[PDB]
Amino acid sequence: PSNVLSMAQLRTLPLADQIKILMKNVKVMPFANLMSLLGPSIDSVAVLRGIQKVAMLVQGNWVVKSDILYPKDSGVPAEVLCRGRDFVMWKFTQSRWVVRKEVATVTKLCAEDVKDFLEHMAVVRINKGWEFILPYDGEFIKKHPDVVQRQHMLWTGIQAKLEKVYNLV
Ligand SMILES: [Zn+2]
Ligand SMILES: [Zn+2]
Ligand SMILES: [Zn+2]
Ligand SMILES: [Zn+2]
């Protein structure tokens, strides 16, 4: 609506708010673009810290965390939606391409929710499934090996949770 903050208004807020607000609006973002938006005043060590609080690494790009889109209060409990979306996001760490029917079969969620999860980080491609919306960011990955390894361990934790509640493979 009309209640959107301009970038100059955004840049007067605490750094944690800027990153949260940007990522919730723009759900997928390359790190270098986030740095550009926040402006030349900010240091990247603080942004590397801040982005991991609110987003996960996917294909070298940053994707806003599910609990930001679906906070604990939508008649479906927020944790059920978070789990479904986290599954989709997990699938995209494995591959740029995701088959909608596999998401429906595994999450057993409503077709509207499955579409909601996919369409805000991917677009359907004719006869090939849903393709993650940003290209693989090989440059961020090359330049931040420590963060990439950490994020891969965090995904290890998330996948273990998903394997407990869902029936993967
Ligand atoms: Zn989550
Ligand atoms: Zn619903
Ligand atoms: Zn939308
Ligand atoms: Zn990985």
Numbering used by the authors: 264 to 336, 342 to 437
What did the study's authors say about this model?
The TFIIF-like RPC4/5 and the TFIIE-like RPC3/6/7 subcomplexes are Pol III specific and can be regarded as built-in general transcription factors that play a fundamental role in Pol III transcription initiation and termination. A notable exception is the subunit RPC5, which in metazoans encompasses a long C-terminal extension (RPC5EXT, ~450 residues long), whose function is currently unknown. The RPC5EXT is formed by two consecutive tandem winged helix domains (tWHD1 residues 259–440; tWHD2 residues 556–708) connected by a 115 residue-long flexible linker.
The tWHD1 is formed by two juxtaposed winged helix domains that form a compact globular domain with one of the two recognition helices, typically involved in DNA binding, buried within the structure. The compact conformation of tWHD1 is observed also in solution as highlighted by small-angle X-ray scattering (SAXS) data. Thus, one possibility is that, analogously to A49 tWHD, the RPC5-tWHD1 participates in an interaction with the upstream DNA and bound transcription factors, thus stabilizing the human Pol III PIC.
